[PDB]
């Protein structure tokens, strides 16, 4: 017909303020990448710090409906920051809660180390 | 000649682990966007929380040379979290320190509200 609601076909300037979706994509990348490299045997101070980091992220996330949704989840399901394995998985399952809320499919949590740190075992990241 | 070191011409799969540069781009977007919507008159608890959030981000940032560089800066130049105006500018000038370290030009701090929240006044984000 003429205009389109597919943003990629419309708004071409990259250096603009992130919208709700684009901030989401950046933020999941930041959180999953921070978790991917977290210690396998973190100190007690690290475990405390990472839980506080996720709590503070929930206080300041600037999409208010998204931040409320996050604060509700963290109240029902505190972050497991005991180890890399536990925290990476914990964060995957949380991300999946949001995906299911929004009508998106589940990400296979078995893929989190490939996806965010190591690259796919088939070599498609090289 | 044949291979290229311009990543865009080589590695086409998007769902791969962020490298140092790509994590940087995501992270500056997250930090500048969080600052852009921070209160103009934050409570004392908010001011304390935002400073602690930036400190914790420096503890967990997974590029070790980058995290060390950040920890050094925050020791010399604590975040000003007193107001949106102060914190957005504080974070711009910090980002500029990193840009100059890496041979990149200064971003004009007068542009931070346009860039990260409001869109350019000429309408090029619409
Ligand atoms: C904490 C948080 C709360 C949010 N709350 C809301 C909200 O309440 N309402 C709303 O409209 N939007 C919310 N958003 C934005 C939303 O989650 C999506 O980021 C946005 O809709 C863009 O979706 P996307 O399809 O690009 O993929 P995203 O969900 O942004 O995912 C980005 C990439 O991460 C990978 N991935 C997907 N799922 C997982 C997983 N479970 N584990 C590991 N990797 C995964 C995939 O490679 C994917 O392409 C929130 C985002 C954040 C960060
Ligand atoms: C906290 C932190 C520390 C880092 N330390 C290092 C390091 O020690 N060594 C290293 O090699 N890399 C480091 N990086 C990565 C580096 O800063 C860049 O992110 C990366 O090199 C990609 O650069 P870029 O050209 O894509 O633009 P980036 O610097 O990633 O900037 C992204 C976008 O932000 C906007 N912008 C640029 N400057 C400002 C500013 N001053 N204020 C507001 N908006 C701005 C521009 O629109 C720009 O395109 C760090 C990143 C972070 C987040």
UniProtKB/Swiss-Prot annotation, chains A, B:
Its EC number is 1.8.3.2. GO terms for cellular component: cytosol; extracellular region; mitochondrial intermembrane space; mitochondrion. Ubiquitously expressed. Highest expression in the testis and liver and low expression in the muscle. FAD binds at residues 20-28, 32, 61, 92-104, 115-116. Its cofactor is FAD. Residues 16-116 form the ERV/ALR sulfhydryl oxidase domain. It comes from the Eukaryota. It catalyses: 2 R'C(R)SH + O2 = R'C(R)S-S(R)CR' + H2O2. The keyword Nucleotidyltransferase does not apply. The keyword Disulfide bond applies. One of its GO terms (biological process) is mitochondrial disulfide relay system. This is FAD-linked sulfhydryl oxidase ALR. It comes from Homo sapiens. The lineage of its organism: Eukaryota, Metazoa, Chordata, Craniata, Vertebrata. The chain holds residues 82 to 205 of 205 of the full protein.
């Amino acid at each position: 017909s003429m205009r389109t609601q597919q943003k990629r076909d419309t708004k071409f300037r990259e250096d603009x303020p992130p919208d709700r979706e684009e901030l989401g994509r950046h933020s999941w990348a930041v959180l999953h990448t921070l978790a991917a490299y977290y210690p396998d045997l973190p100190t007690p101070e690290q475990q405390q710090d990472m839980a506080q980091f996720i709590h503070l992220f929930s206080k300041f996330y600037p999409x208010e409906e998204x931040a409320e949704d996050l604060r509700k989840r963290l109240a029902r399901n505190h972050p497991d920051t005991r180890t890399r394995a536990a925290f990476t998985q914990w964060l995957x399952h949380l991300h999946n809660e949001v995906n299911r809320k929004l009508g998106k499919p589940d990400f296979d949590x078995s893929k989190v180390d490939e996806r965010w740190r190591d690259g796919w075992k088939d070599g498609s990241x090289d």
